[model samples]
Target: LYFQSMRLHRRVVITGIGLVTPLGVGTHLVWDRLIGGESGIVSLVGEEYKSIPCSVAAYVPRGSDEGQFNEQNFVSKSDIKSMSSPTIMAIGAAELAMKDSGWHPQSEADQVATGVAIGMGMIPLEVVSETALNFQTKGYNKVSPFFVPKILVNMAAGQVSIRYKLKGPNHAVSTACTTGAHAVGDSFRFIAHGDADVMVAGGTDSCISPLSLAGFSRARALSTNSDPKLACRPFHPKRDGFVMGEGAAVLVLEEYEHAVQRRARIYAEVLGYGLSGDAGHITAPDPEGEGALRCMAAALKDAGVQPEEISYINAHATSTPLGDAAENKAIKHLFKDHAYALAVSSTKGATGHLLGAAGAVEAAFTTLACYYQKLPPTLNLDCSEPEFDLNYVPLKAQEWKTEKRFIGLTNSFGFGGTNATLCIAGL
Candidate 1:
């Protein structure tokens, strides 16, 4: 049954974007790497990420100057001690986004009206791994005092709020892979509801640990330790499973009027957001993808857009066979002839699946598409799936010409059947 719209209360727009991904450290790097069809999924030889079947992961590439602590940009000595990889990435991206937006709130009143919403999955691997190793080997005394602080999923949101001095509606959403999209959608709603004028929203995750791998492996969600590059081949006939990826993606969203008043560099307008659930499954999507269809339809209705308005879709195709097919089915059911007309791409081939951060990073990509008028391609897609009659923008970036306005959609579906859809429009 189709549901009625609740009517969003305000207009929201994206003013800035920041990202730290396996491809690189910022949105530009990620976009370039993705458009070039580079694969960050690699054969893992590290001792920490072993024990699972898939010894492959999409780890952020470290620079020569970035030390093990990577404290060059640290605000204080203790900052390095208390922070984890994901938190560090989140802070870095947030800093970039704030600068990009030129959001200089000069008064406590402004600060009080600005909030943060970040999404994170699985706690810090280093902290947990070290603590577990200490407890098993030498007892609990060796556990560090900062263990809990560094490992909590909310630390990213907390730290972002602290650093930015944001006081309004500080919240974090952790819906596995759907967390990023939920954070974005929830932040938009917050602004629409008059809870805040500006919001720092996105997701960060770092779960590339021995236990994380073992847990997913136990669930049969990880690829078998065979081919590294092809391990996460989404929508492919011989697909296996998803490889774990670690990174963060953040965006600065503000009320449309507030942005215009500040004369901010607008990335795109937040047209619509929809969220839904698949009551039928715990970790797998419904075979027919009814929930995804509902979520997409809701977003279109909320935006007052038709199926033909969407120029592209950034799919959450994590290379899982069932999940990929389900998304295809949902898109076909919703768009019909427009499904074939629309272009779709998945960046997982380049950045892998950063779980909670997947939606944020992909949303950044979608925003970039509208900003630059270019649709990035899904890397490694040499052939189209015979079952789905859609244009998978394959292997190379395509130029999208839009004289008037262009709208794009991004989908993020997570374990336990949580689904999120976001619409971005350029004018």
Candidate 2:
């Protein structure tokens, strides 16, 4: 089936990527660490967090780490007072992406054609806790005037727009773990449909507080393993649960013609975007893997590609026992014979799970894999489940020997049964 609507759809390409991850700050640093099979998951040790079941997390580096995030380096101290961690992360990432794109809009027309689409899956629990305490101890009058703005989910996108002078669409999506993928996907559509010429899109999330950890622990969503390296073994036989991570990733997307006209560096082409709802469970995915299967199939259909054409997939196997198995079943069922040949891996084993930022970061990795013609390895997969027989690029990065243009897919499934998939290809 041909995409008749695609005739009217304008092409989109990624011009720049900005990443703030546990592995490092810039895109190159994080990508190098990820490709090197380095584990960003570190043991969480503190008197306050001693009671939490989860002992490991992928927290953003500071102080000594190269390209470390120093708030003063990006924003003034006074500016950060009105922003939450996620918003600050968003601004930092957006600024980096804009700089990398080299698209400083001095003209009002250029500014008006640019947009921002950044989001967070959850608010900072520390902020919520502190505000509640202030209200109780000093009354409502004592609450900070910036409290509401800091906590609002849409404030990240708002801040990016104001800082960059992007007068076009300022949109945000807060769909649990799929927030980042949705943000990028929405931006792709916005540019394709002529809503904007350029879009700053991705997700930011920083909720590693005691309350946040305790809540996920209570729900049994996090791994309790003390070994940081083995805590998040996605698709492994011993896998238990996801390790919480805090970070942000942003991508600068522009119309293909617009990018080419300006001689902007192109990373990858945005081929297709597919979204689906499980409509089954609140947190758990469909047992039959129907939602995942449909989502991948829909993405391929939207991309106007055959099932056999895709050679790589950045799987959403979040180290959870059921989640990994379900996604595996979906891949096998959807691809059939091509499933065995596909190089599938979950970078979460190395980076842990970045929650809402997982999709965007993984998408960036997928784009890089296409550009570099190499696939990053999944860490700590010493033993895979007997049923999962797919060629999971295990333990070490491998060269992607493809004579054809590399096409890849990134999957993100979130709580509330939301699922999103992006089909990306080397330009």
Candidate 3:
């Protein structure tokens, strides 16, 4: 079902973006590395992960440098000690996004009208393990007072709200891998409905500990490939599984008129958002890709655009054999002739599977693609699948060819069969 009438809500525009990915920190830095076809995956080597089958992961680098993530660079020592890894990354990303937007709320009314919606997929495994051990060995008193706050998934949004005094629609989502996409979508609705004028929305996750690796390894969901460069080969013939990655990405979404009034630089316009469910399996996607197809169709319907209008897609191909093929099938089924014309790629090949942060990171990349008129390439996609026929933009970046306004879509599907899609276009 599609509505013929125009949208009755306010338009939303993306003004600023911030990302801390395996590729690097900062938006342009990571986008540059991504377009240059750089892989951040490295061989995992530690006593804790010796027994796990997965041997490679994409981890955020930390050091005393501009591009590297140092706690002191963003927050104080006391604040760092009280927050989890994901919280720290989320807060830092939010700060960078606010700076990029240049929309610091000076008046109490502006602060109250701004909101935040950040999310995480999983709690930090290190905190969970250490807290359990302390409870077993030393007793309950040994655990720090900040233990509960650190592990809560919603604390990322809470911390951002507290930091900036954002009083409108403090919301969070924890729908596994789809968390970030959902966060952005929900914030868009909030703004469109006049609940807020601006929203800080995205996702974060940094649970790359041995326990987390072993858990996913036991599920046979992670790649055991030892070669860092070829570990995450999305849409490739011999792709096995996804590579674990940890990072955070947040974007500054504002009302179209509000952004124009402030003369803020716009990255892209948020056209539409669609969500769906598979209702098929706990971890595995529907083999027919029904959920994926519906999500894309719904997003297009919401955006009031035809399939042929889409010129680019940032796919949620996590490099898993089944998942990548399923998405390809869905895209072909939905787009038909346009599937071949659309330049589609998965940034996961370069940054690995960022789980909760994947959708937001890719959404940022999609917005950048519209703004810059370039499409990022899929790293390590040496050979295309014989069954799938589409322009995957493998191994090299491509110039987006569109005389009209550039229209793009980003897809994010999670373990619980939840799916979300976002339609973005150049302003």
Question: Using Cα atoms with residue i matched to residue i, what is each candidate's TM-score against the true structure?
Answer: 0.93, 0.97, 0.97
Residue 176's lDDT in candidate 1: 92
lDDT of each structure? Answer: 0.84, 0.89, 0.91
Worst 10 residues of 1 by lDDT: 65-74
Candidate with better TM-score, 1 vs 3: 3
* Poorly placed runs, candidate 1 (over 4 Å): 1-8, 47-50, 64-71, 74-77, 132-143
| TM-score result, candidate 2 | 0.97
RMSD of each: 3.1, 2.0, 2.1
Itemize residue pairs with steric clashes in candidate 1.
234-319
Candidate 3 has an lDDT of 0.91
Candidate 1 on 333-375: residue-level lDDT in tens? 9999889888888888888899989999989999999888898
Distance from true position, residue 110, model 3, in Å?
A: 0.7
Model 3 residue 376 CA deviation in Å? 0.3
lDDT of 2 by residue, 1-427 (tens): 5654444689999999999888878888888888999978898988999889888999888754476887667778998999998888888888888888898887899999999999899988788889999999999997999999999899999998998799989998999888989999999999999999999999999999888889988888889888997899988988889999988899999999999999999999999999999999998888778899988888898899888989799999999888999999999999999999889989998777888789888888998998888899988888766797888899999898688889999999999989999999997
